[PDB]
Design a protein around this ligand. Structure first.
Ligand SMILES: [Mg+2]
Ligand SMILES: [Mg+2]
Ligand SMILES: [Mg+2]
Ligand SMILES: [Mg+2]
Ligand SMILES: [Mg+2]
Ligand SMILES: [Mg+2]
Ligand SMILES: [Mg+2]
Ligand SMILES: [Mg+2]
Ligand SMILES: [Mg+2]
Ligand SMILES: [Mg+2]
Ligand SMILES: [Mg+2]
Ligand SMILES: [Zn+2]
Lengths: 82, 127, 100, 151, 99, 114, 211, 224
RNA sequence: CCGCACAAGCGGUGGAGCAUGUGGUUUAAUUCGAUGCAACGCGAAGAACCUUACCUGGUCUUGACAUCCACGGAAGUUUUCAGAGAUGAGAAUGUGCCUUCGGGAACCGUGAGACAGGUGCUGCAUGGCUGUCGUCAGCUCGUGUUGUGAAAUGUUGGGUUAAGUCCCGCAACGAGCGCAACCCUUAUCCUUUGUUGCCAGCGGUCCGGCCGGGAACUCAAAGGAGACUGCCAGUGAUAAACUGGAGGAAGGUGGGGAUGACGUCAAGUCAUCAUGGCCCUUACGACCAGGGCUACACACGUGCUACAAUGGCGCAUACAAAGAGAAGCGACCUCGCGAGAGCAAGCGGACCUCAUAAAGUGCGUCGUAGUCCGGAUUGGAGUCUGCAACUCGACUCCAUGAAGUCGGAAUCGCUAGUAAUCGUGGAUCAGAAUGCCACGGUGAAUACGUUCCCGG
């Protein structure tokens, strides 16, 4: 899916926010606009809100979730049948 | 005497050359049968020479370029006939009745707008 | 169309130009393998920072005469309409209708 | 042809025998404009004809055709505004053509695991005046006669 | 040691004139020409929708045919190369000079 | 002639009867046949049992058919358990690789419903 | 149905182009864009001059342009001061040394631009379009134009509907590439609405090609 | 022409008694074999008095139009006009040949333009098929206006053969006041002919007699 | 009377899966239009961001963009914090040129409001452009004649053409818009010119068109010549016209395009552009992040791949044209199974490259089966483009092996190098082709006729 020469794309400022949380220990889920940045090992057992485009939804990350994009977890549409 | 020929059919062109001697065919430095994996094409080049039955009288150094196997052969036959008319000087009447000097034109039609093929019509759904 | 959009394009272009060098060498570092994998890591991270509009991908062909996003002719950079017109007048040197 | 009948392309003869009915015939068996794929199958029949059914396959070529070449034909026509299925003759060329269709179709309905084998068999089959091509000559020679209410 | 020269244009008449004028001037300067060799002219076809309103049938086709000639002189001297620089040609034509 | 998963699928060319087993496809089977050194077209029936023994080995070396299905099941299982986008779709039984759901999604959609 | 452009079709047969300069794929797009700009600037300057044609040929280094107009003395001004500053503005707006020449047309009626624009103007004088166009065709026939055709479309006299109409004089053949036909469109923005005008002028068939 | 000169040619011959016109009774000698016989006693003096007027017109520089559309006598009338340097119509009469003089003049100009153009050149510039087509158009214009290309204006006198056949011409002439000289068979209506010659109009011999006598007197009137 | 209109033929649609548009549905948004022909793989010659107008939120109010006059600062260059970025916040360097010294140029920023802006509504206010009937054969006028005149004639009739094509008849004759022809291309040949193109002859050659050379022929591309029922025979009203034959490379407008007579349908487009008028104007104007344009109970249109032995598979093996290309093609060689990667020359292109065309042909294979058919879908694992690929890119490898066993009603397309097939390139494009636009390979069958289906 992505070239493994440079590795999984993550946002710098997300690294900043997450690492600050970490060194500061647990903080209420910080908010995020970058659905795209890839989950990392440092981001484990912590929650974060992510703009589904109308609003940021809180997702609580876990070990396996690492190596995937944060956005996949957030649904950008709704549907309930017909 | 080497006899020059220029036969063209479809998108192939063919220079042709005839030398009196034991009958032989050398096209693009290949040998006819070795050139064509199809029999019809060997027969098509032989057909003008076969009709006059002077195959044993003239050998053939020939060259063909462009087009596909059928155009190649057609153009070659055309060039053969022109060389035969040049050498005999009386074969023009025989070739004209035979039908080998026709050339035939028939270049493939150019695709035209709004048409999946130069004449094919996209399906028009009435209903 | 919207002079707003036209100016947006002009800006995107002019801006994304100057960083050509930086942008370039940045990829080079990143693309270039045999690196320590940190020099790149930060390097790609650094590149991320630049004005998102820096990417040539951000740019969008737009008819010069009308600022039209579709119907762009790289050979002229114009709208299929306007190129037809300019042709009909004979501006385009040598351009004539094609029949074959 | 509402103005003038436009002639069908005039054909040239097979070289393997200088014959043409082959040529017109192979043109029938031909699929997707591939001449090489078609001619292979006739020789996978006529050759096996000259031996399985007896020499002179080129004469067996038509003994079936003879067994199939239709005579009576029904060109249903609304002459009075109502479709009349009137039995009618057809010039020789057609019945040859028709027959040729009438056999090739039968070489597509026999399985046998190969197309070459099917053409060989049906040919001989109808070459003995027995099978389908002759049958679809029979039935047409049957329903043509069955509807003879009015000219 | 050569002086080869490629001429490009949109109208053969101009390109023919340019070549004619360059071979003849070479004869005046005592330059030996390789002749005005014609070369495959480049045809560029453009398909273009002709209607602002939505349709696929409305279309037009235009062409740019780039006529192309080649000349060359085997033995140049000041008198030959300088004369080519002195020569002034029309706009629509293109002059490329190589030794 | 037992092999991983199905035993004696059919009397066909080694590479064919080989690919017959789930998790064994044209390439894995041809590579196993080359690794065994057994001939490509020799029928699995009538093949030496000693040769068949080399096969049980070279195949059990791979994930076997029964094991493979379990593991892919677990993969998809997680994929769903994470409630992830494709996780959801899988649960919804809808195309999970951006295939358009507007029309022609029947392959996974199933029979037409009013 | 929709007619074709008489000028375009007869290009390279009886109608020479408006810009000759050679070019390559890389510079062709900029060269036409700059050519469009000078024409746009020049036509506005020559609006007072009532220019009929503006040709632009770029030599390999220099750019040259020639103007055809009914008012040579207006373009000359005094010692070419106007056209001098014009040569300046164009040389710069095109980033090339510019050479400006004038070849005034001696038959203003026999040019579709001059006539078309005169019509547009007179319409802006709100004169009776009908008599206007009719006077123009008579003047062209007096000048010997083999044939003339004119057309005014949309809001004729601020009509609350578009009474588009056309008038034909003498012979104006189309579909014959042998025929020399000057053509031109023009517009007039009346307070009620925008009205288009087309003009054809057939001056006789040419023989022997573009020459 | 003397009565004996006419009679040998057969001028007395006429149409059938079944087919005659009412006003012709004074000019009819009688009937034989159900055939109308024309009276030469009237024919000769009227023809002479018409020749007097024709000589007068030609002696004041008159332009004379010989008119006849008979397929037999077309060449006779054409040669008759050529023998006296005059103008003729020998092919089917076209309505408005006189009243519509302007359109005929434009057609005369087109005939003149085509012949001049072929001599000047530019036929080579045209495709060979087109040049042949232009020659065919020039030939068609000649077959239509060979006689009147050089008439210049409306003629001063008309000579008509079989006035009933050419009735449109005489109606035009009367509408213009141009005098009509006509050979009038018994089946014709003589009202339109100001100098009427009652005589056979089909027979080649009598027609040639009329034409030759008229042309001799026309050349005489020209000579002065 | 005529037209793939019908008829005779092939190949299809309608079944299957998928691509693709549209309606419905849902959505926060799923932006706007097109709606039988003449919408529905349409605009769009290419939505990840951008694109973009839709939604969510963040923001600005003479402004994103333009002119205006002030006030100041060179212009710039570099650089740090917060922010999601919009942006603020800074913090350094430079702070330049002409000047007649005033300033000016130059830009930058702050103020003033005049003003900017609109993809806001009105194609029933319009221009401009296009679709259609329809390349359908028609539409008319000058003169003339007749009619007091509204008018008619011409254009009518008969032969007869692709044609109101042409002739004969004919109070009609001429002409125009037209038709035709002139244009491009292709079909033959000739002249000129011969490199990067060719090698007939040869001398050489390592044996390669490769090199002495050749300038023959192929090609190349400018000029030319050639098809006119000309010619002949036979019909026909003796005219036009037709038919056949010969010659001829081509024969009866030689094949193919471009060209659309009026006029029609308030056709379509005020989101190409222009524009009448109306409305917003701290906002219907401007910027930014995310989402959306890809949604699915659904329904229709268009397209693609199939259902298999003319097949599939493997092995070897062959004949092309037309093109694109220097922020480009990217050779060669090395690495990898591939996606690719590395290396890196040559090429602005008769020079290099993309690129070695498939169907075919030769050999073995399978032996009729849901198969060694078909390939969907899904898991796993990667490659690449682009800051960035999750929604939502393309491609590779491993595995999975659907549905589908030729598809009712009904229906559509084509008369020859046509349809059918199989490859090839281009546009659009950072990337994103079953879509379009072109190029070649191989290459059918039928058309009795016009009763009829429709159309005129
Ligand atoms: Mg883009
Ligand atoms: Mg709207
Ligand atoms: Mg609409
Ligand atoms: Mg409307
Ligand atoms: Mg967004
Ligand atoms: Mg969409
Ligand atoms: Mg479809
Ligand atoms: Mg297969
Ligand atoms: Mg089956
Ligand atoms: Mg398409
Ligand atoms: Mg093709
Ligand atoms: Zn009489």
């Amino acid at each position: 899916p992505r070239s493994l020469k440079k590795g999984p794309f993550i946002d710098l400022h997300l690294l900043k926010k997450v690492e600050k949380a970490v060194e500061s220990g647990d903080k209420k889920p910080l908010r995020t606009w970058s659905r795209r940045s890839t989950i990392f090992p440092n981001m484990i057992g912590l929650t974060i809100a992510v703009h589904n485009g109308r609003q940021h939804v809180p997702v609580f990350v876990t070990d396996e979730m690492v190596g995937h994009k944060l956005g996949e977890f957030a649904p950008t549409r709704t549907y309930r049948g017909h | 005497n080497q006899y020059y020929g220029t036969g063209r059919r479809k998108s192939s062109a063919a220079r042709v050359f005839i030398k009196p001697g034991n009958g032989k065919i050398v096209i693009n430095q290949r040998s006819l049968e070795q050139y064509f994996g199809r029999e019809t094409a060997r027969m098509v080049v032989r057909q003008p020479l076969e009709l006059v039955d002077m195959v044993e009288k003239l050998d053939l150094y020939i060259t063909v370029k462009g087009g596909g196997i059928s155009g190649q052969a057609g153009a070659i036959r055309h060039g053969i006939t022109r060389a035969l008319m040049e050498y005999d000087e009386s074969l023009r009447s025989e070739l004209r009745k035979a039908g080998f000097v026709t050339r035939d034109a028939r270049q493939v039609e150019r695709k035209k707008v709004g048409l999946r093929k130069a004449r094919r019509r996209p399906q028009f759904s009435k209903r | 169309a919207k002079q707003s959009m036209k100016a947006r394009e002009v800006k995107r272009v002019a801006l994304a130009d100057k960083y050509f060098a930086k942008r370039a060498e940045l990829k080079a570092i990143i693309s270039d393998v045999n690196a320590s994998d940190e020099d790149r890591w930060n390097a790609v991270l650094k590149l991320q920072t630049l004005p998102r509009d820096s990417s040539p991908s951000r740019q969008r062909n737009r008819c010069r005469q009308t600022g039209r996003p579709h119907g762009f002719l790289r050979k002229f950079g114009l709208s299929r309409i306007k190129v037809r017109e300019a042709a009909m007048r004979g501006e385009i040197p040598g351009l004539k209708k094609a029949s074959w | 042809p509402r103005r003038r009948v436009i002639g069908q392309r005039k054909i040239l003869p097979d070289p393997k025998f200088g014959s043409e009915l082959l040529a017109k015939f192979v043109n029938i068996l031909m699929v997707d404009g591939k001449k090489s794929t078609a001619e292979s199958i006739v020789y996978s029949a006529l050759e096996t004809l000259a031996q399985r059914s007896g020499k002179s396959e080129l004469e067996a070529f038509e003994v079936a055709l003879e067994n199939v070449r239709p005579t009576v034909e029904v060109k249903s026509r609304r002459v009075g505004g109502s479709t009349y299925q009137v039995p009618v003759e057809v010039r020789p060329v057609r019945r040859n053509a028709l027959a040729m269709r009438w056999i090739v179709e039968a070489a597509r309905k026999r399985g046998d695991k190969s197309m070459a084998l099917r053409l060989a068999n049906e040919l001989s089959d109808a070459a003995e005046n027995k099978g389908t091509a002759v049958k679809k000559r029979e039935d047409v020679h049957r329903m043509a006669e069955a509807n003879k209410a009015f000219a | 040691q050569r002086i080869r020269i490629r001429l490009k244009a949109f109208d053969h008449r101009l390109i023919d004139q340019a070549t004619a004028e360059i071979v003849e001037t070479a004869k005046r300067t005592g330059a030996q020409v390789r002749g005005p060799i014609p070369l495959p002219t480049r045809k560029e076809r453009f398909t273009v929708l002709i209607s602002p309103h939505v349709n696929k049938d409305a279309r037009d086709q235009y062409e740019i045919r780039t006529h192309l000639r080649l000349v060359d002189i085997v033995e140049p001297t000041e008198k030959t190369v300088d004369a080519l620089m002195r020569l002034d040609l029309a706009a629509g034509v293109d002059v490329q000079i190589s030794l | 002639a037992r092999i991983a998963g199905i035993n004696i699928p059919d009397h066909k060319h080694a590479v064919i009867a080989l690919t017959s087993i789930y998790g064994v496809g044209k390439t894995r089977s041809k590579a196993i046949l080359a690794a065994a050194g057994i001939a490509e077209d020799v029928k699995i029936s009538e093949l030496s049992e000693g040769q068949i023994d080399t096969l049980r080995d070279e195949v059990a070396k791979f994930v076997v058919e029964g094991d493979l299905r379990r593991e892919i099941s677990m993969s998809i299982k997680r994929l769903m358990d994470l409630g992830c986008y494709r996780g959801l779709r899988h649960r919804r039984g809808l195309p999970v690789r951006g295939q358009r759901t507007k029309t022609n999604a029947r392959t996974r959609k199933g029979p037409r419903k009013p | 149905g929709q007619k074709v452009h008489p000028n375009g079709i007869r290009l390279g047969i009886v109608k020479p182009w408006n810009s000759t300069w050679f070019a390559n794929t890389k510079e062709f797009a900029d060269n036409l864009d700059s050519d469009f700009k000078v024409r746009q600037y020049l036509t506005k300057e020559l609006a007072k001059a009532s220019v009929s044609r503006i040709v632009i040929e770029r030599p390999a280094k220099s750019i040259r342009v020639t103007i055809h107009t009914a008012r040579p003395g207006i373009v000359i001004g005094k010692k070419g001061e106007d056209v001098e500053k014009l040569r300046k503005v164009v040389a710069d707006i095109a980033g090339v040394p510019a050479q400006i020449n004038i070849a005034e047309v001696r038959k203003p009626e026999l040019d579709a631009k001059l006539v078309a624009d005169s019509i547009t103007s007179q319409l802006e004088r709100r004169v009776m379009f009908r008599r206007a166009m009719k006077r123009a065709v008579q003047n062209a026939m007096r000048l010997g134009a083999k044939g003339i055709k004119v057309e005014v479309s949309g809001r004729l006299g601020g009509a609350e509907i578009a009474r588009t109409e056309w008038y034909r004089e003498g012979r104006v053949p189309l579909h014959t590439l042998r025929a020399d036909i000057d053509y031109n469109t023009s517009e007039a923005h009346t307070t009620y609405g925008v009205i288009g005008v087309k003009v054809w002028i057939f001056k006789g068939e040419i023989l022997g090609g573009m020459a | 022409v003397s009565m004996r000169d006419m009679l040998k040619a057969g001028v007395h011959f006429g149409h059938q008694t079944r087919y005659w016109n009412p006003k012709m009774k004074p000019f009819i000698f009688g009937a034989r074999n159900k055939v109308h016989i024309i009276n030469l006693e009237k024919t000769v003096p009227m023809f002479n008095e018409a020749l007097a007027e024709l000589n007068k017109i030609a002696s004041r520089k008159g332009k004379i139009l010989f008119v006849g559309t008979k397929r037999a006598a077309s060449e006779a009338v054409k040669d008759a006009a050529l023998s006296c340097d005059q103008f003729f119509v020998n092919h089917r009469w076209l309505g408005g040949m006189l009243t519509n003089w302007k359109t005929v003049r434009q057609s005369i100009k087109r005939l003149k333009d085509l012949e001049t153009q072929s001599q000047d050149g530019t036929f080579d510039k045209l495709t060979k098929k087109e040049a042949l087509m232009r020659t065919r158009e020039l030939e068609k214009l000649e077959n239509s206006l060979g006689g009147i290309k050089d008439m210049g204006g409306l003629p001063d006198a008309l000579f008509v053969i079989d006035a009933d056949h050419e009735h449109i011409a005489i109606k035009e002439a009367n509408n213009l006041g141009i005098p009509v000289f006509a050979i009038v068979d018994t089946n014709s209506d003589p009202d339109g002919v100001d100098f009427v010659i009652p005589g056979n109009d089909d027979a080649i011999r009598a027609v040639t007699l009329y034409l030759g006598a008229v042309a001799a007197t026309v050349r005489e009137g020209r000579s002065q």
